[PDB]
Design an enzyme around this catalytic site. Structure first.
Site, PDB file in Angstrom:
ATOM      1  CB  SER A  40       0.158   5.305 -10.785  1.00 44.37           C
ATOM      2  OG  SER A  40       0.010   4.662  -9.517  1.00 44.37           O
ATOM      3  CE1 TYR A  76      16.817  -5.489  -3.908  1.00 49.77           C
ATOM      4  CE2 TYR A  76      19.076  -6.244  -3.430  1.00 49.77           C
ATOM      5  CZ  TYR A  76      17.995  -6.222  -4.263  1.00 49.77           C
ATOM      6  OH  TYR A  76      18.007  -6.901  -5.462  1.00 49.77           O
ATOM      7  CG  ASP A  89      -2.537  -3.189  -2.303  1.00 51.75           C
ATOM      8  OD1 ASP A  89      -3.375  -3.820  -3.046  1.00 51.75           O
ATOM      9  OD2 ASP A  89      -1.611  -2.507  -2.759  1.00 51.75           O
ATOM     10  CE  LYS A 132      -0.897  -5.095  -5.350  1.00 56.10           C
ATOM     11  NZ  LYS A 132      -1.598  -4.264  -6.467  1.00 56.10           N
ATOM     12  CG  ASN A 144       1.729  -5.030  -2.481  1.00 58.10           C
ATOM     13  OD1 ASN A 144       2.436  -4.557  -3.390  1.00 58.10           O
ATOM     14  ND2 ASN A 144       0.558  -4.537  -2.178  1.00 58.10           N
ATOM     15  CG  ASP A 189       2.422  -0.785  -1.819  1.00 62.32           C
ATOM     16  OD1 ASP A 189       1.972   0.209  -1.173  1.00 62.32           O
ATOM     17  OD2 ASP A 189       2.315  -0.871  -3.077  1.00 62.32           O
ATOM     18  CB  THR A 222      -5.153  -5.348  -5.991  1.00 62.54           C
ATOM     19  OG1 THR A 222      -4.106  -4.418  -5.691  1.00 62.54           O
ATOM     20  CG2 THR A 222      -4.895  -5.976  -7.339  1.00 62.54           C
TER      21      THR A 222
HETATM   22  C1  LIG Z   1       9.699  -1.422  -2.209  1.00 63.03           C
HETATM   23  C2  LIG Z   1       9.999  -2.894  -1.713  1.00 63.03           C
HETATM   24  S1  LIG Z   1      10.535  -2.688  -0.009  1.00 63.03           S
HETATM   25  C3  LIG Z   1      12.052  -3.735   0.110  1.00 63.03           C
HETATM   26  C4  LIG Z   1      12.207  -4.139  -1.317  1.00 63.03           C
HETATM   27  N1  LIG Z   1      13.275  -4.840  -1.727  1.00 63.03           N
HETATM   28  C5  LIG Z   1      13.290  -5.161  -3.022  1.00 63.03           C
HETATM   29  N2  LIG Z   1      12.380  -4.784  -3.949  1.00 63.03           N
HETATM   30  C6  LIG Z   1      11.319  -4.070  -3.568  1.00 63.03           C
HETATM   31  N3  LIG Z   1      10.344  -3.743  -4.485  1.00 63.03           N
HETATM   32  C7  LIG Z   1      10.529  -2.834  -5.567  1.00 63.03           C
HETATM   33  C8  LIG Z   1       9.654  -3.296  -6.716  1.00 63.03           C
HETATM   34  N4  LIG Z   1       8.204  -3.425  -6.469  1.00 63.03           N
HETATM   35  C9  LIG Z   1       7.316  -3.248  -7.518  1.00 63.03           C
HETATM   36  O1  LIG Z   1       7.723  -2.952  -8.645  1.00 63.03           O
HETATM   37  C10 LIG Z   1       5.785  -3.392  -7.520  1.00 63.03           C
HETATM   38  N5  LIG Z   1       5.479  -4.402  -8.613  1.00 63.03           N
HETATM   39  C11 LIG Z   1       5.119  -2.000  -7.679  1.00 63.03           C
HETATM   40  C12 LIG Z   1       5.165  -0.927  -6.563  1.00 63.03           C
HETATM   41  C13 LIG Z   1       4.866   0.400  -6.739  1.00 63.03           C
HETATM   42  N6  LIG Z   1       4.946   1.180  -5.578  1.00 63.03           N
HETATM   43  C14 LIG Z   1       5.324   0.317  -4.594  1.00 63.03           C
HETATM   44  C15 LIG Z   1       5.571   0.535  -3.219  1.00 63.03           C
HETATM   45  C16 LIG Z   1       5.973  -0.491  -2.331  1.00 63.03           C
HETATM   46  C17 LIG Z   1       6.120  -1.786  -2.869  1.00 63.03           C
HETATM   47  C18 LIG Z   1       5.865  -2.000  -4.250  1.00 63.03           C
HETATM   48  C19 LIG Z   1       5.473  -0.954  -5.124  1.00 63.03           C
HETATM   49  C20 LIG Z   1       7.819  -3.837  -5.108  1.00 63.03           C
HETATM   50  C21 LIG Z   1       8.944  -3.944  -4.072  1.00 63.03           C
HETATM   51  C22 LIG Z   1      11.210  -3.682  -2.218  1.00 63.03           C
END
Ligand SMILES: C[C@@H]1SCc2ncnc(N3CCN(C(=O)[C@H](N)Cc4c[nH]c5ccccc45)CC3)c21
EC number: 2.7.11.11
Lengths: 19, 336
Positions: free
Chosen positions: B39, B108, B152, B154, B157, B170, B187
């Site tokens: 959001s 990442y 949070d 789930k 996350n 998160d 959640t």
């Molecule tokens: C941010 C985390 S940290 C290391 C990492 N590496 C790969 N993808 C990631 N993702 C990106 C995609 N995500 C999502 O789309 C969630 N479905 C929604 C989300 C919204 N704000 C966030 C902040 C932190 C983690 C997830 C979210 C979670 C994690 C992350």
């Protein structure tokens, strides 16, 4: 079955935090 | 374990008291792709120009943060994340802000969300679910010893790393608190009854949420679900749980003790604290030190496809990163 009811429900995708 | 946590706490408090700030800037990275969404902005795969390393850049629009009344929670997220250090927590590598946005650049984790693999495969065997659960147990032991509540838990996350291990991401609702706290956040599927009932709550909410996570991992659906949040809360509060036919007796017994409405009875919340969970029959085969050390062979290792592969992640629509020539919310986010 509970699995069918879950799969047919509107909450099987990524779920949003509330605030 | 007591001496380990004691030193962990000195390390954490030095960083909590004098946080890292302004450790990169946007033009040090080339944005590649959206990895995930929310959001108040989004997470992008980026490449850092001078090192060539990939990172996941969480970008938060300050104006959307203010609208959703997440100012203090966003300041909590960043202050806590820059201070913590545990094998199953994602590292904050850089943070900074510009006129429009806040940025948190993490390592990442290319294996994707546990949520993706869980929904695709359907459910995890009990050994697979217990390997993940053990990491969450040790992670909450560590967070709670710093007076942090996570709030949070789930599958969305939890990221799966290149070793098949979990990384918790998160910290949007994480909070450092010595008493009771009152915010309605989390959640819906994962909320403990005492949250829903607005009476004040503490860290035992994380152990209830570990119950929900373990159930969902091993069942493939959560213990309380319905089409709307309000119907979810009615089920949680009634608290009656039904278990799949395939759940072991050991698992059902653990779950009745985590998904326990009564605080005087909920595991993780008794005199013996986390050891009621570690010493439960369900965890008998768990070597807690070997999990901490990442010596246990993981039950599933995501397909690895080179640095910067995003195939373990869904596709998302892509939008411009707008940076106003006018500084927004400068005062509110001064400490970020
Ligand atoms: C941010 C985390 S940290 C290391 C990492 N590496 C790969 N993808 C990631 N993702 C990106 C995609 N995500 C999502 O789309 C969630 N479905 C929604 C989300 C919204 N704000 C966030 C902040 C932190 C983690 C997830 C979210 C979670 C994690 C992350």
């Amino acid at each position: 079955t509970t699995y069918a009811d879950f799969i047919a429900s509107g909450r099987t995708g990524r779920r949003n935090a509330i605030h | 374990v007591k001496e380990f946590l004691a030193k962990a706490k000195e390390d954490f408090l030095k960083k909590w008291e004098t946080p890292s700030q302004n450790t990169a800037q946007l033009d040090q990275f080339d944005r590649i792709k959206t990895l995930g969404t929310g959001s108040f902005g989004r997470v992008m795969l980026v490449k850092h120009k001078e090192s060539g390393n990939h990172y996941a850049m969480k970008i938060l629009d300050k104006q959307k943060v203010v609208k959703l009344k997440q100012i203090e929670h966003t300041l909590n997220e960043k202050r806590i994340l820059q201070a913590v250090n545990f094998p199953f927590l994602v590292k904050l590598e850089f943070s900074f802000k510009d006129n429009s946005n806040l940025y948190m650049v993490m390592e990442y984790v290319a294996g994707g969300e546990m949520f993706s693999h869980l929904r695709r495969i359907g459910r995890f065997s009990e050994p697979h679910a217990r390997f993940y659960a053990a990491q969450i147990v040790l992670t909450f032991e560590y967070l709670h010893s710093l007076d942090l509540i996570y709030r949070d838990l789930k599958p969305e996350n939890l990221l799966i790393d290149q070793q098949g291990y979990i990384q918790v991401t998160d910290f949007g609702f994480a909070k450092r608190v010595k008493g009771r706290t009152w915010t309605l956040c989390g959640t819906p599927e994962y909320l403990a009854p005492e949250i829903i009932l607005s009476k004040g709550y503490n860290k035992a909410v994380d152990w209830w949420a570990l119950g929900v996570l373990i159930y969902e991992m091993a069942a493939g659906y959560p213990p309380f679900f319905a089409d709307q949040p309000i119907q979810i809360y009615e089920k949680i509060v009634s608290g009656k749980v039904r278990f799949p036919s395939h759940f072991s007796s050991d698992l059902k017994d653990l779950l009745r003790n985590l998904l326990q409405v009564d605080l005087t009875k909920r595991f993780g919340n008794l005199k013996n604290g986390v050891n009621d969970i570690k010493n439960h029959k369900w965890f008998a085969t768990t070597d807690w030190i070997a999990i901490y050390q990442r010596k246990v062979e993981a039950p599933f290792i995501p397909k690895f496809k080179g640095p910067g592969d995003t195939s373990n992640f869904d596709d998302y629509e892509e939008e411009e990163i707008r940076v106003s020539i006018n500084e927004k919310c400068g005062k509110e986010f001064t400490e970020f």
